[PDB]
Amino acid sequence: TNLKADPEELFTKLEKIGKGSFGEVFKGIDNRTQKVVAIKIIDLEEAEDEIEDIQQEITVLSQCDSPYVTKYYGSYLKDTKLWIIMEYLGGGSALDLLEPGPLDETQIATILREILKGLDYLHSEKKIHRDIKAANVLLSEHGEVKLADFGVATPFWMAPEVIKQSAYDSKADIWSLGITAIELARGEPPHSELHPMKVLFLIPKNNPPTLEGNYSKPLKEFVEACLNKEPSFRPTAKELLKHKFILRNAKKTSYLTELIDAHHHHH
Ligand SMILES: CNc1ncc2cc(-c3cc(F)c(-c4cccc(C)n4)cc3F)c(=O)n(CCCCN)c2n1
């Protein structure tokens, strides 16, 4: 965290583009390179109880160096406000790209494959993402797919062992990936109609969700593989990258620009 430099001289703050954990996010311009950045501004007096979680997320992102993880450029403190500078991804989130209509299985498989490449990287680095969901998967304007917003070390994407506060590992991300697969196929996670407190006991109580609808058997089996109540029965990210659903359906990420365009024309 840079304490002398004035982020308001270094960056031009433009329109709001989201609301993440602990503050609002803006499109911005790096005034020296003219590159577009994403800027989160957190007021450290209003978000005092969460400062350690913010620091922890910055530390983790600063240790990542992967095409599949959104880049962290640095942070600045001006008066009471912490500016966090991230890579800007102009395709938006995968959740956004669900708005014009359903994804086809090639789009689903391509997005899941790239998420798996990010998880393979993190898990190989002995890291856990902890908040895999379509809202936290960002696309560049070229169709590149990257992970954003790590969870701190809403219940719909949480593995049962995470809810039961059991010691969990990277297989919790594999469960969340299975929920995200359903969300990419159907538009919403399981139980999305229910009150979160009900979901909190339904996830440990119920059999795991399945993907319902006219979807290929390999996609249903991909979901089933991820959504096993027993974490040791969930495959690794490495293994899921070789799953038949991925191998038979995933294509070049550049094809996802058609998905981004469809979202542009829908608005
Ligand atoms: C539309 N294109 C686009 N491109 C890039 C980003 C980056 C981020 C972003 C990610 C982060 F991990 C942190 C971060 C890092 C360390 C600590 C903390 C507390 N936060 C900050 C961020 F601003 C972001 O929010 N959006 C908004 C959508 C969020 C979806 N969930 C972006 N939107």
Q: How many domains does the chain have?
A: 2
d(CA 14, CA 195): 35
- Same domain for 107 and 61, yes or no, is no
Last-in-domain residue among 88, 108, 132 = 88
- Strands 92-93 and 81-87, how do they pair? unpaired
Out of 131, 169, 173, 261, pick the active-site residue.
131
CA 70 to ligand 1 centroid distance, Å = 8
- Same domain for 21 and 126, yes or no, is no
Token code pair at residue 238: 């490495």
* 53 included as an active-site residue: no
- Same domain for 24 and 82, yes or no, is yes
Resolution in A: 1.7
Position in ligand 1 atom list of the atom nearest CA 42: 19
The helix (H) or strand (E) run that includes residue 76 is strand 72-78
Could you tell me the residue range of the domain that residue 201 belongs to? 89-267
**Helices 171-186, 217-226: inter-axial angle, 10-degree rounding:** 150
Name every protein residue with a CB atom under 6 angstroms from any ligand 1 atom.
Answer: 17-18, 20-22, 25, 38, 40, 54, 57-58, 61, 70, 84, 86, 88-89, 92-93, 135-136, 138, 148-149
- Same domain for 67 and 101, yes or no, is no
For residue 91, the number of C-alpha atoms closer than 13 Å in the C-beta half-sphere is 29
- Same domain for 64 and 163, yes or no, is no
- Same domain for 139 and 112, yes or no, is yes
Q: Which residues of 132-163 are buried (b: 16+ CB within 10 A; e: fewer)?
A: bbbbbbbbbeebbbbbbbbbeeebbbbbbbbb
DSSP letter for 208, please.
P
Last-in-domain residue among 38, 67, 88 = 88
- Strands 145-147 and 137-139, how do they pair? antiparallel
Residue with tokens 């909190």: 200
- Same domain for 125 and 66, yes or no, is no
Cα-flanking dihedrals φ and ψ of residue 48, to 5°? Answer: -75, -40
Closest-CA residue, ligand 1 atom 28, reads 18
Residue type, 248: R
- Same domain for 66 and 167, yes or no, is no
